[PDB]
Design an enzyme around this catalytic site. Structure first.
Site, short mmCIF file in Angstrom:
data_model
loop_
_atom_site.label_atom_id
_atom_site.label_comp_id
_atom_site.label_asym_id
_atom_site.label_seq_id
_atom_site.Cartn_x
_atom_site.Cartn_y
_atom_site.Cartn_z
N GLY A 1 32.44 43.98 51.72
CA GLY A 1 33.79 44.01 51.20
C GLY A 1 33.85 44.23 49.70
O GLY A 1 32.83 44.18 49.01
N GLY B 1 36.57 43.26 46.48
CA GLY B 1 37.79 42.67 45.95
C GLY B 1 38.04 43.03 44.49
O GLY B 1 37.35 43.87 43.91
N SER B 2 39.05 42.39 43.90
CA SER B 2 39.40 42.66 42.51
C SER B 2 38.43 41.93 41.57
O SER B 2 38.29 42.30 40.41
CB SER B 2 40.85 42.25 42.22
OG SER B 2 41.30 42.80 40.99
N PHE B 3 37.76 40.91 42.09
CA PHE B 3 36.71 40.22 41.35
C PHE B 3 35.42 41.04 41.36
O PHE B 3 34.62 40.96 40.43
CB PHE B 3 36.45 38.83 41.92
CG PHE B 3 35.68 38.84 43.22
CD1 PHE B 3 34.29 38.74 43.23
CD2 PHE B 3 36.34 38.97 44.43
CE1 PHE B 3 33.58 38.77 44.41
CE2 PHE B 3 35.63 38.99 45.63
CZ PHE B 3 34.25 38.89 45.61
N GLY B 4 35.21 41.80 42.43
CA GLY B 4 33.95 42.50 42.62
C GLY B 4 33.64 42.66 44.10
O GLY B 4 34.55 42.63 44.93
N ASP B 5 32.37 42.81 44.44
CA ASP B 5 32.00 43.19 45.81
C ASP B 5 31.38 42.04 46.59
O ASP B 5 30.91 41.06 46.02
CB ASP B 5 31.04 44.37 45.78
CG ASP B 5 31.64 45.60 45.14
OD1 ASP B 5 32.81 45.92 45.44
OD2 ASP B 5 30.95 46.25 44.32
N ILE B 6 31.35 42.18 47.92
CA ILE B 6 30.80 41.12 48.76
C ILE B 6 29.70 41.74 49.61
O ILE B 6 29.89 42.81 50.16
CB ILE B 6 31.87 40.51 49.66
CG1 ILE B 6 33.14 40.20 48.85
CG2 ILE B 6 31.33 39.24 50.36
CD1 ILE B 6 34.32 39.79 49.71
N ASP C 1 47.72 31.11 46.86
CA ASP C 1 47.48 32.52 47.20
C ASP C 1 47.35 32.63 48.72
O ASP C 1 46.40 33.22 49.23
CB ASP C 1 46.22 33.04 46.48
CG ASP C 1 46.10 34.57 46.53
OD1 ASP C 1 47.11 35.25 46.76
OD2 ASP C 1 44.97 35.08 46.34
#
Ligand SMILES: [Zn+2]
Lengths: 102, 369
Positions: B17, B19-24, B129
């Protein structure tokens, strides 16, 4: 060894090349024709690959780990998560839902 | 070079995945082979959150459905957080099911989601959230259990020493997802426990109906968009919002929207609403979600198809699943503007039973199983 944007990118390219081209089983759920249908890779990798063809291991272990991770490094270990207990603070999980018929 | 590690103990595998934080990434414990998920956040980020999240996760540890943190720290140019490998999110599974959930599945999910939020609140946090994307099923035998993730916007709503509730404050910015944001969040009012539950209500209605009335509003700017969603939310009654649904949903929304700022929710009342609805519909506690039966039916069908040898293909599988599990699959009807009775809803059981199926040969094979 060090984690960089470039080393990560190169690892992912090798993993996805194996994934796209080299999963050589004949399982419907593992197939590229099945994958082509789904848009969110997690529904394949973390959901449909939870199923079990041989009723002992899921497909993420029996097939993905065999043709992708093991192909990259034979020593890459993945446990059989279906051998774990039904754990105390978790909802009951009917195992039959994973056992592919025939 | 193909062996990339975090915390000296975990090996990085397939990206799962972004996200806006980074990747998973999928990963594995090098010694045990245990599967994990590894979140990577560049230290160049303008809004770092992984360090904060890891502390909130550790603080909340031990709650049912709270992911266990295995590790957090710096690795090269990233911060890395290693947690339990989880399955797909409820938004993912919503898409899998072609963006409608049955009442049985919505109720099953509601009950677990209530417990998660109740637990978080009991630890003095509000999530802030709430959205389908932040609730994930487990994997393996944790696959029946809803987990909650993403504590990046979470905050404490009461002082540890005094248990004094945070003060009522205004001019606060809308920091979460607009689609599920509480009305008071749009008004720039400090969020509290009531807002997590109101947002959860929107999620549950969304699961039932396929969408919310404030989706698809068009605007020239972001603030315009937020304001138009706000005005839509302000002006749709609970009656209108919950039309076509069992009265329980309307009762839930009215309760949550009526809560005072510092008021403790009656979580048991909310759970009882849906538990009672489940009893009235005679849904068995069998841990079978829509996707459980759709995935199983699909695997079984496709294997038979292969021996014999889209949305239409999915719909055929869904029709077969509904014939096999006719008491499980009851849906909201877009035409309904009243609140259906349990007997009225259960009419669909008969429909599912008699639903005609397209493929003669394949069915004969499925029967002969
Ligand atoms: Zn396979």
């Amino acid at each position: 060894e060090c984690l960089t944007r470039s080393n990560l990118k190169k690892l992912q390219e090798k993993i996805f090349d194996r994934e796209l081209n080299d999963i050589a089983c004949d399982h419907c759920l593992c197939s590229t024709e099945n994958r082509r249908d789904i848009k969110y890779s997690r529904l394949w990798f973390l959901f449909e690959l939870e199923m079990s063809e041989n009723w002992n291991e899921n497909l993420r272990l029996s097939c993905y780990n065999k043709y992708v991770y093991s192909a990259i490094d034979e020593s890459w270990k993945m446990e059989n998560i279906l051998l774990k207990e039904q754990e105390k603070h978790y909802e009951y999980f009917p195992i039959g839902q994973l056992l592919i018929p025939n | 070079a193909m062996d990339l590690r975090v915390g000296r103990k975990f090996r990085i595998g397939r990206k799962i995945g972004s996200g806006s934080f980074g990747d998973i990434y999928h990963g594995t414990n090098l010694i045990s082979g245990e599967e994990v998920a590894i979140r990577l956040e560049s230290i160049r980020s303008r809004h770092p959150q992984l360090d904060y999240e890891s502390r909130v996760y550790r603080y909340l540890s031990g709650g049912v459905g709270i992911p266990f943190i295995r590790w957090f720290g710096r690795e090269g140019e990233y911060n890395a957080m290693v947690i339990d490998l989880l399955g797909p999110s409820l938004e993912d599974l919503f898409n899998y099911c072609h963006r409608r959930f049955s009442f049985k599945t919505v109720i099953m999910l509601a009950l677990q989601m209530f417990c998660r939020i109740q637990y978080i609140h009991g630890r003095s946090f509000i999530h802030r959230d709430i959205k389908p994307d932040n609730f994930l099923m487990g994997v393996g035998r944790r696959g029946s259990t809803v987990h909650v993730i993403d504590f990046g916007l979470s905050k404490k709503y009461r002082d540890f020493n005094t248990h004094r509730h945070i003060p009522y404050r205004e001019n606060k910015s809308l920091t979460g997802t607009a689609r599920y944001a509480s009305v008071n969040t749009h008004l720039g009012i400090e969020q509290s426990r009531r807002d997590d539950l109101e947002s959860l209500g929107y999620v549950l209605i969304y699961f039932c109906k396929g969408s919310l009335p404030w989706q698809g509003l068009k605007a020239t700017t972001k603030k315009q968009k937020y304001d138009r969603i706000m005005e839509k939310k302000l002006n749709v009654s609970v009656e209108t919002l919950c039309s076509g649904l069992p009265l329980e949903f309307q009762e839930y929304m009215a309760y949550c929207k009526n809560l005072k700022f510092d008021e403790k929710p009656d979580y048991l009342f909310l759970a009882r609403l849906f538990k009672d609805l489940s009893i009235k519909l005679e849904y068995h506690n069998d841990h079978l979600f829509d996707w459980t039966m759709l995935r199983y039916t699909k695997a079984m069908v496709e294997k038979q198809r292969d021996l014999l040898i889209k949305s239409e293909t999915f719909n055929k599988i869904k029709l077969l699943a509904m014939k096999k599990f006719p008491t499980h699959f009851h849906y909201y009807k877009n035409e309904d503007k009243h609140n259906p009775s349990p007997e009225e809803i259960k009419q669909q059981t008969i429909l599912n039973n008699n639903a005609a199926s397209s493929l003669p040969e394949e069915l004969l094979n499925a029967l002969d199983k």
